[PDB]
């Protein structure tokens, strides 16, 4: 069901190595619905190539547009298992500190602050 279930560590690593080669300016991001989530829909895909100059505030807006949310639906984004300290951090900086050993940046969204 989850990304890390579906692919061997060898396969995730090799995919990041291909993203680096073919989309060198993009951050490879895995975005996943909280497995206890009631309200929010699932995304059309799992793997995202985010332009590396956008800040976290702009990534939240991209995903709220991808889910087609209205303006008083709630949305919370965990990075690398934990809350974001700030939405002003550029995703290039967040990638460098929060990336997984496989080389993806892992994110989870839910309708409640409680996951
Ligand atoms: O992506 C979704 N719909 C968009 C596609 C682009 C045009 N506007 C509608 C979507 C959102 C939430 C649940 C399921 C699917
Ligand atoms: Cl690129």
From Swiss-Prot:
<dbReference type="GO" id="GO:0012505">
    <property type="term" value="C:endomembrane system"/>
</dbReference>
<dbReference type="GO" id="GO:0097001">
    <property type="term" value="F:ceramide binding"/>
</dbReference>
<dbReference type="GO" id="GO:0005776">
    <property type="term" value="C:autophagosome"/>
</dbReference>
<dbReference type="GO" id="GO:0005739">
    <property type="term" value="C:mitochondrion"/>
</dbReference>
<dbReference type="GO" id="GO:0005874">
    <property type="term" value="C:microtubule"/>
</dbReference>
<comment type="function">
    <text>Ubiquitin-like modifier involved in formation of autophagosomal vacuoles (autophagosomes). Plays a role in mitophagy which contributes to regulate mitochondrial quantity and quality by eliminating the mitochondria to a basal level to fulfill cellular energy requirements and preventing excess ROS production.</text>
</comment>
<keyword id="KW-0496">Mitochondrion</keyword>
<keyword id="KW-0833">Ubl conjugation pathway</keyword>
<dbReference type="Pfam" id="PF02991">
    <property type="entry name" value="ATG8"/>
</dbReference>
<dbReference type="GO" id="GO:0000421">
    <property type="term" value="C:autophagosome membrane"/>
</dbReference>
<dbReference type="GO" id="GO:0005829">
    <property type="term" value="C:cytosol"/>
</dbReference>
<dbReference type="GO" id="GO:0008017">
    <property type="term" value="F:microtubule binding"/>
</dbReference>
<dbReference type="GO" id="GO:0016236">
    <property type="term" value="P:macroautophagy"/>
</dbReference>
<comment type="similarity">
    <text>Belongs to the ATG8 family.</text>
</comment>
<dbReference type="GO" id="GO:0008429">
    <property type="term" value="F:phosphatidylethanolamine binding"/>
</dbReference>
<dbReference type="GO" id="GO:0006995">
    <property type="term" value="P:cellular response to nitrogen starvation"/>
</dbReference>
<keyword id="KW-0597">Phosphoprotein</keyword>
<dbReference type="GO" id="GO:0031625">
    <property type="term" value="F:ubiquitin protein ligase binding"/>
</dbReference>
<dbReference type="GO" id="GO:0006914">
    <property type="term" value="P:autophagy"/>
</dbReference>
<keyword id="KW-0449">Lipoprotein</keyword>
<keyword id="KW-0206">Cytoskeleton</keyword>
<keyword id="KW-0963">Cytoplasm</keyword>
<dbReference type="InterPro" id="IPR029071">
    <property type="entry name" value="Ubiquitin-like_domsf"/>
</dbReference>
<dbReference type="GO" id="GO:0009267">
    <property type="term" value="P:cellular response to starvation"/>
</dbReference>
<keyword id="KW-0832">Ubl conjugation</keyword>
<dbReference type="InterPro" id="IPR004241">
    <property type="entry name" value="Atg8-like"/>
</dbReference>
<dbReference type="GO" id="GO:0031090">
    <property type="term" value="C:organelle membrane"/>
</dbReference>
<keyword id="KW-0968">Cytoplasmic vesicle</keyword>
<keyword id="KW-0493">Microtubule</keyword>
<dbReference type="GO" id="GO:0005930">
    <property type="term" value="C:axoneme"/>
</dbReference>
<keyword id="KW-0072">Autophagy</keyword>
<dbReference type="GO" id="GO:0000423">
    <property type="term" value="P:mitophagy"/>
</dbReference>
<dbReference type="GO" id="GO:0031966">
    <property type="term" value="C:mitochondrial membrane"/>
</dbReference>
<dbReference type="GO" id="GO:0031410">
    <property type="term" value="C:cytoplasmic vesicle"/>
</dbReference>
<dbReference type="GO" id="GO:0097352">
    <property type="term" value="P:autophagosome maturation"/>
</dbReference>
<comment type="subunit">
    <text>(Microbial infection) Interacts with Hantaan hantavirus glycoprotein N; this interaction contributes to the virus-induced degradation of mitochondria by autophagy, which leads to degradation of host MAVS and inhibition of type I interferon (IFN) responses.</text>
</comment>
<keyword id="KW-0472">Membrane</keyword>
<protein>
    <recommendedName>
        <fullName>Microtubule-associated protein 1 light chain 3 beta</fullName>
    </recommendedName>
</protein>
<dbReference type="GO" id="GO:0000045">
    <property type="term" value="P:autophagosome assembly"/>
</dbReference>
<comment type="subunit">
    <text>3 different light chains, LC1 (a cleavage product of MAP1B), LC2 (a cleavage product of MAP1A) and LC3 (produced by one of the MAP1LC3 genes), can associate with the MAP1A or MAP1B heavy chains. Interacts at microtubules with CABP1 (via EF-hands 1 and 2) but not with calmodulin. Interacts with FYCO1 (via C-terminus). Interacts with TP53INP1 and TP53INP2. Interacts with TBC1D25. Directly interacts with SQSTM1; this interaction leads to MAP1LC3B recruitment to inclusion bodies containing polyubiquitinated protein aggregates and to inclusion body degradation by autophagy.</text>
</comment>
């Amino acid at each position: 069901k989850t990304f890390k279930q579906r692919r061997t560590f060898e396969q995730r690593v090799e995919d990041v190595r291909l993203i680096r080669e073919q989309h060198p300016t993009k951050i490879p991001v895995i975005i996943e619905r909280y497995k206890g989530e009631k309200q929010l829909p699932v995304l059309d895909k799992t793997k995202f190539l985010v332009p590396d100059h956008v800040n976290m505030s702009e990534l939240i807006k991209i995903i709220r547009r991808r889910l087609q949310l209205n303006a008083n639906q709630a949305f919370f984004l965990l990075v690398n298992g934990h809350s974001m300290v700030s939405v002003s951090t550029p995703i290039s900086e967040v990638y460098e500190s929060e990336k997984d050993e496989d080389g993806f940046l892992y994110m989870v969204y839910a309708s409640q602050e409680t996951f």
